[PDB]
Design a protein around this nucleic acid. Structure first.
Lengths: 110, 50, 488, 219, 20
RNA sequence: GAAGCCAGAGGAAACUCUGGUGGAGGCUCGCUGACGUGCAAGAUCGUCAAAUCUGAGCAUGGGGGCGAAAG
């Protein structure tokens, strides 16, 4: 006719980071120990002026190796598990598929 | 609260570690400074300030 | 006048852009400049014409910022197009946020801008700055003032939710709605929550030379392998988008439940009943004890909340997947059954029973009570497996309630028992034949458990009062119920 | 034509349930009960009475004053002075006790009396526990405890005299001949109601002749 | 059946049966 | 032996019938178990094999349990 919107968030998605988190949570090594071990050979290494190819070459060949714990791995898997990862329908159909596989194995054995 | 546990399962807390505090039965969480220290150890840029 | 001059200008611009788009790259800026004029008629006209021109020029893909002859033609045209579309969206934002009240000469620029925004949402979701478009839509659906523009934007978002097949637009809209509700501290009008219910992702010999033939063959194999890869990546991307949207939706549902907003619990419970089968399994158990905790908190308004949670639990378990999961998942509704049994008397003396396509969100407490009793006594699954003790106890307590409730609620309960006696019969006929009354124990009305109350040691006497009840309707209800009892 | 008439009375007391408008509800409930007595029609009113009981005025501790008892035969509304007064609390308690008395003596022989009364007993006992966990109105407390005791006694009495009645769904001669031969004073609740009819009468002529002496003295 | 027909939310309006 | 095509007799047309042309068919001829669903005390519906023949060349998949797959 008539032409409400008004500090960085640190998230651990890495097995080594969750392993260090577990080690800090347990009375295994303390804060002072973490700084002391943080002054290692990888410390004081430049990152600001460097080209992407150089940085990625070092990133792929210079990851320090640390043991991973089963607890840290399970915690990372639980945190990164999808919300629709294990629906009732999918669990039921996986069980049905394995039951069918066993039945077919038995019939082949027959 | 069961609702609080449901929220935690949906969007895990920032300092979630999956462990249980031996002192108090509640699950133990990392604090802001502890998460900052883990970040500093993982990246290596500034392990200590000043 | 100036108005006709402007109409001629816009007509030239639009016709040129429909006929030859590339040859005219600056006429988007020409529309912006002609709309810069301060007279309201030409502002309305230019907004509508810009709606039309962007609607018919926006491509079926997004473009990258160049940064850093025909090719340069397209680059210039696309850069001008995106700059113009950003300008149009900014102007739409300003006009939509502008004050509606004016003197009455038709739809104001606010409603016109809202119509333009709705059309843009429905036509070009894929293109850029969907964020700004949906932000305007949400800023309108965040005011608690039901208007014609309000219902238009609700319809637009509902249409987008029911038409999105990829998922990114739905994800971004859900995120904006969730953040808006959290910022408003859940003071919204339940329509934005029913939008989550409306979400869909949660539900002739042409001659060819020798050279050409080999190419078209090659692109045949190429498109075959591309279709395969596209199908697989489409499955993975749909799954991930569904996971993210489910996370946000259940987060807002759980926060509303924990805050106990009185006017949103029905919608939240409906959403839970709709999507708990799409969420994980241990979480299904967690929602069962969450409903248990809501019942306990209400125990320590309140009646409606308790009935809503009971209906929610029963519907959740009445879902097919949950029904087949029952034994494996340890999903027992004994708590809900006992709670309903213990609350029957209080609800019977409650005076607010009738102070009022959905399956959970029902406005009347007696309607909720019939849903609970239907789920208990007449379940869709294993209807011929219901415990006779449960049936008899509920029949007795429901006769007492029918004595002590208002007329229409009483007639509803009486019809429910009519259907119960039709369906089961011999299991409860002893409740009316006194010579089959059991002699082992005494009936315990104030019992804590359904089995604790011995229901087969008493007889249905309530007829001699309900027959002289003042309501003819409940009178023929008793007549039909007794007719079925006799025709067993 | 009784149905339409009742519907209107229910709607009349449900239009607005306010402590200001309790007297009007009490008067219309008395009208309905007297209709029920003359006819043989059941009128659910325990809901309304339990509402006025679990209403606002009758729970919070009252306010001290010195006024005259409201005459519940000339009230459509209550004066703003009678908002928290012990006088108003006592008046509404007495009226509730009365209306319950006529209701439960008016249906004191149906073979489903315990099935009709038991919800009222449990509600009253819950209220009594709540208020002795409220106010301090021991008068209303004692009146309701004796009321609930007599209701329980009447329900039991119905138990013993109905335990030996055959009620097959195709043979109901005994229940149609259940208790025509007993009059409304033999039942324990009948004795209760007649006793407090006598007590109400003694208080009424007390106040009536009393106000007559005050009028004569003023004259 | 009948129970559902009464459990429909539209069956508890409150219309007086003298406005037939 | 069907679509399709042709004549004629009725039907307002749509169609019916007769006499034909046509030679497509998951049509013929020569010498069962394993399961799934069941909403009861088992009814019903669905899935899995038996997969043109042949000379010369050529490639791939193989066990178990766990897990939603990814592994």
């Amino acid at each position: 006719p008539g032409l409400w919107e008004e500090r960085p968030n640190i998230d651990i998605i890495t097995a080594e980071a969750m392993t260090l988190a577990h080690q800090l949570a347990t009375g295994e090594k303390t804060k002072a120990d973490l700084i002391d071990e943080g002054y290692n050979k990888y410390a004081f290494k430049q990152k600001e002026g460097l080209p992407d190819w150089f940085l990625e070459d070092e990133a792929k060949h210079d990851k320090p190796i640390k043991p991973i714990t089963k607890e840290a791995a399970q915690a990372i898997k639980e945190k990164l598990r999808a919300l629709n990862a294990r629906p009732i329908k999918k669990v039921a159909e996986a069980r049905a598929r394995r039951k069918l596989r066993q039945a077919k194995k038995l019939e082949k054995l027959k | 609260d069961a609702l609080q546990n449901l929220l935690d399962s949906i969007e895990v807390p920032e300092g979630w570690t999956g462990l249980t505090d031996p002192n108090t039965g509640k699950p133990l969480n990392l604090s802001r400074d502890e998460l900052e220290l883990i970040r500093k150890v993982q990246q290596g840029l500034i392990p200590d300030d000043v | 006048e100036q108005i006709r001059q402007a109409q001629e200008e816009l007509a030239k611009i639009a016709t040129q852009l429909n006929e030859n788009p590339e040859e005219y790259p600056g006429h988007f800026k020409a529309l912006a400049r002609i709309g810069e004029t301060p007279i309201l008629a030409i502002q309305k006209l230019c907004i509508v014409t810009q709606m039309a021109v962007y609607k018919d020029v926006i491509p079926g893909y997004r473009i990258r910022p160049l940064g850093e002859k025909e090719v340069k033609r397209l680059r210039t045209y696309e850069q001008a197009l995106v700059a113009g579309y950003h300008g149009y969206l900014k102007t739409l934002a300003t006009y939509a946020a502008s004050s509606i009240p004016e003197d009455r000469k038709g739809e104001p620029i606010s409603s016109i801008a809202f119509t333009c925004a709705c059309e843009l949402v429905n036509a070009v979701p894929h293109f850029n700055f969907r964020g700004d478009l949906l932000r305007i839509l949400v800023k309108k659906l965040s005011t608690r003032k039901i208007d014609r523009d309000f219902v238009k934007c609700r319809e637009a978002l509902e249409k987008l939710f029911q038409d999105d097949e990829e998922g990114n637009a739905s994800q971004e809209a859900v995120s904006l709605l969730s953040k808006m509700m959290k910022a408003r501290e859940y003071r919204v009008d339940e329509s934005v929550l029913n939008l989550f219910l409306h979400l869909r992702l949660l539900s002739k010999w042409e001659f060819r030379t020798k050279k050409q033939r080999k190419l078209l063959k090659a692109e045949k194999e190429a498109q075959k392998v591309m279709e395969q890869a596209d199908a697989t990546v489409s499955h993975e991307e749909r799954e991930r988008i569904q996971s993210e949207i489910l996370k946000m939706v259940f987060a807002t549902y759980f926060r509303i439940l924990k805050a106990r907003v009185p006017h949103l619990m029905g919608a939240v419970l409906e959403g839970l009943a709709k999507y708990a089968h799409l969420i994980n399994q241990d979480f299904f158990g967690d929602l069962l004890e969450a409903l248990k905790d809501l019942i306990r908190d209400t125990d320590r308004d309140t009646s409606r909340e308790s009935l809503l949670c009971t209906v929610t639990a029963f519907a959740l378990l009445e879902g097919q997947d949950a029904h087949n999961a029952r034994s494996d998942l340890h999903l027992d509704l004994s708590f809900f059954i006992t709670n309903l049994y213990r609350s029957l008397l209080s609800l019977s003396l409650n005076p607010d029973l009738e102070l009022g396509n959905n399956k959970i969100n029902l406005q009347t407490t007696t309607v909720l009570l019939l849903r609970c009793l239907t789920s208990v006594l007449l379940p869709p699954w294993n209807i011929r497996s219901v415990p006779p003790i449960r049936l008899a106890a509920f029949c007795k307590q429901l006769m007492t309630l029918a004595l002590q409730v208002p007329e229409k609620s009483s007639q509803a309960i009486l019809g429910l028992l009519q259907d119960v006696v039709h369906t089961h019969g011999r299991k409860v006929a002893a409740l009316w034949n006194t010579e089959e009354r059991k002699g082992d124990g005494t009936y315990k009305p104030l019992s804590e458990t359904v089995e604790g109350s011995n229901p087969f040691t008493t007889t249905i006497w309530e007829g001699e009062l309900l027959r002289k009840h003042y309501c003819p309707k409940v009178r023929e209800g008793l007549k039909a119920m007794e007719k079925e009892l006799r025709s067993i | 034509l009784i149905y339409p008439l009742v519907q209107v009375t229910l709607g009349a007391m449900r239009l607005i349930p306010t402590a200001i408008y309790f007297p009007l509800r009490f008067h219309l409930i008395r009208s309905l009960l007297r209709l029920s007595r003359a006819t043989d029609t059941y009128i659910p009113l325990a809901s309304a009475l339990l509402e006025v009981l679990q209403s606002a005025e009758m729970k919070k501790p009252p306010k001290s004053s010195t006024l005259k008892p409201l005459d519940f035969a000339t009230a459509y509304k209550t004066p703003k002075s009678y908002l928290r007064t012990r006088v108003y609390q006592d008046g509404v308690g007495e009226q509730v006790v009365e209306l319950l008395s006529e209701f439960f003596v008016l249906w004191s022989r149906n073979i489903a009396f315990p099935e009709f009364a038991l919800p009222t007993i449990v509600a009253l006992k819950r209220w009594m526990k709540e208020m002795r966990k409220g106010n301090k109105n021991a008068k209303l407390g004692s009146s309701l405890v004796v009321l609930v005791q007599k209701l329980e006694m009447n329900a039991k009495f119905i138990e013993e005299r109905r335990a030996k009645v055959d009620f097959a769904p195709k043979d109901r001669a005994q229940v149609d001949a259940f208790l025509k031969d007993l009059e409304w004073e033999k039942t324990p609740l009948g004795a209760y109601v007649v006793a407090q009819r006598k007590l109400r009468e003694e208080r009424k002529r007390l106040m009536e002749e009393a106000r007559r002496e005050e009028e004569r003295k003023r004259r | 059946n009948k129970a559902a027909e009464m459990s429909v939310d539209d069956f508890f309006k409150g219309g007086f049966e003298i406005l037939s």
